[PDB]
């Protein structure tokens, strides 16, 4: 009758005490007749009530997107607890359930290498600064770029890719004016992952 | 109850005359009590008759799967022709159609740059040779590594990532024993894409 979908928190929210990590239960295909759905949240089968149903929004196919959002503890998600979503109703014969948790296994620390642009990129107007991040488990990770403690926002990061040893890698690419790279400005690659000391490391990159 | 799935040809199959590119129409959850299936095929809305349809295959869940395969001309797919599979079935409300084509928009040449390992990495047993491929459109592309004309099979490539100018990039990572890199063996990164001359370029990498 209805498709239910359950989403983990963002990497960056579980790793920093100041941020707020949330699990997001999302029902699409809800027709006009049935208005309100009975969300029930459980942390290891044990019930918890810390919920918040975010009222509905309109759609281009006559159905409505009914969302719920459970705040969770940083150390609960990291330590691997099970987070069960249950949507009850009347227009469903039996009630639908969904269970997510952190991927299992020994966390592994990322190794973070910075890479300058290629000699052959050096003919262009904009150049490519590369941060290789490899050897990490699980795949949950965040990458950002800095110069003089100000965010550089002209970067893209690949999704994580499953390597031959069961660990993950990605590449982040920052594009900068060749003018900046030649003056000799320092650029930094910031990585946040559970297996890093204080969940944080940075590596600099500059023209040797 | 019946769902239709329509699969493009592989990137390499359309770029090389030697290969035979195919589009594939798969029908699933066909019923036991009403198993009669017809396929019609259209190329830019004009019907074509050369498709090769297989006999229905019983699955382990009391349902039939049926596959039809249309051979496409390389230049038709690269000229952006639309392939429509249409699937009919006596006991079904109305025919299920699906359409597929190469992604729309102007083609754009890949720039391929090779990157040696970070000196911070020149300490481990194994090092990472990096191939950066950026500025390409559409996202359909193939990447491989070699030394001395032999495939180097210890490689992983990222999926294509949408860059800020509307073009795609990715990276391919080749892991070699640190010793082979110190000797001075040449490694090569080859790329196939419709916007490259002869649909092909190769960029080599060695100790400097
Ligand atoms: C009516 O239309 C609506 C809306 O349509 C959409 O929006 C409109 C405006 C138009 O643009 C439409 O063209 C467009 O499609 C339909 O509602 C949609 O229903 C589909 C199902 O058909 C749902 O798709 C699922 O999506 C998830 C991924 O969703 C994230 O990423 C999307 C970005 O591409 C984004 O749209 C989503 O909102 C969502 O975003 C995340 O959400 C939270 C906030 O909610 C946030 O905290 C996150 O940070 C945010 N992240 C990002 C990056 O966006 C996808 O995973 C589902 O696929 C899984 O399940 C499938 C079937 O169950 C299966 O085919 C796949 O294999 C896949 O993976 C496995 O599946 C098994 C099988 O059950 C599963 O159990 C496993 O866990 C899983 N395994 C693994 C290892 O992963 C699925 O495809 C969308 O939720 C929904 N779209 C939107 C916009 O809400 C509605 O259905 C229409 N109705 C009709 C009748 O047509
Ligand atoms: C009864 O059994 C059958 C058969 O299953 C088999 O038998 C049972 C008993 C068990 O033994 C099973 O383990 C066994 O598999 C069930 O059949 C399945 O039904 C599901 C759907 O119900 C199908 O799902 C779709 O699969 C495709 C991907 O399919 C490729 O990869 C599969 C998994 O890796 C592989 O098994 C497939 O055969 C197929 O492989 C490809 O084959 C082609 C053709 O020859 C080949 O050239 C390719 O090389 C090859 N590729 C690979 C990698 O091998 C998946 O793409 C579908 O996803 C789309 O749609 C979803 C739902 O609509 C949606 O959630 C997704 O987001 C996605 O949507 C699309 O997204 C893209 C871009 O993002 C876009 O282009 C599209 O526009 C968009 N489409 C939308 C929104 O609609 C989907 O998951 C299985 O393939 C199918 N199994 C087989 C073998 O055919 C059946 O369901 C069972 N019945 C019941 C009642 O349970």
TrEMBL record, chains A, B:
Q: Where does Zn(2+) 1 bind?
A: 32
Quick one: which residues bind Zn(2+) 3? Answer: 82
- Subcellular location(s) of the protein: Cell membrane
Q: List the disulfide bonds.
A: 25-85, 131-189
User: Ig-like domain: which residues?
Assistant: 1-101, 110-206
Residues the record lists as binding Zn(2+) 2: 74, 199
Quote the protein name from its UniProt record. Answer: Uncharacterized protein DKFZp686C11235
């Amino acid at each position: 009758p209805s498709c239910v979908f359950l989403f983990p928190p963002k990497p960056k929210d579980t790793l920093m005490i100041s941020r707020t990590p949330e699990v997001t239960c999302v029902v699409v295909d809800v027709s006009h007749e049935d208005p309100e759905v009975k969300f029930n949240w459980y942390v290891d089968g044990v019930e918890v009530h810390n919920a918040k149903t975010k009222p509905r929004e309109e759609q281009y196919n006559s159905t409505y997107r009914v969302v719920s959002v459970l705040t969770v503890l940083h150390q609960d998600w990291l330590n691997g607890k099970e987070y069960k979503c249950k949507v009850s109703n009347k227009a469903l014969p039996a009630p639908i359930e969904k269970t997510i948790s952190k991927a299992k296994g020994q966390p592994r620390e990322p190794q973070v290498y910075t890479l300058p642009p290629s000699r052959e990129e050096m003919t262009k107007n904009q150049v490519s600064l590369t941060c290789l991040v490899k050897g990490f488990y699980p795949s949950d990770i965040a990458v950002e770029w800095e110069s003089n403690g100000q965010p550089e926002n002209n970067y893209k990061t690949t999704p994580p890719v499953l390597d031959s040893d069961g660990s993950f890698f990605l590449y982040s690419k920052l594009t900068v004016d060749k003018s900046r790279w030649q003056q000799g400005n320092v650029f930094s690659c910031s990585v946040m992952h559970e297996a890093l000391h204080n969940h944080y490391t940075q590596k600099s990159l500059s023209l040797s």
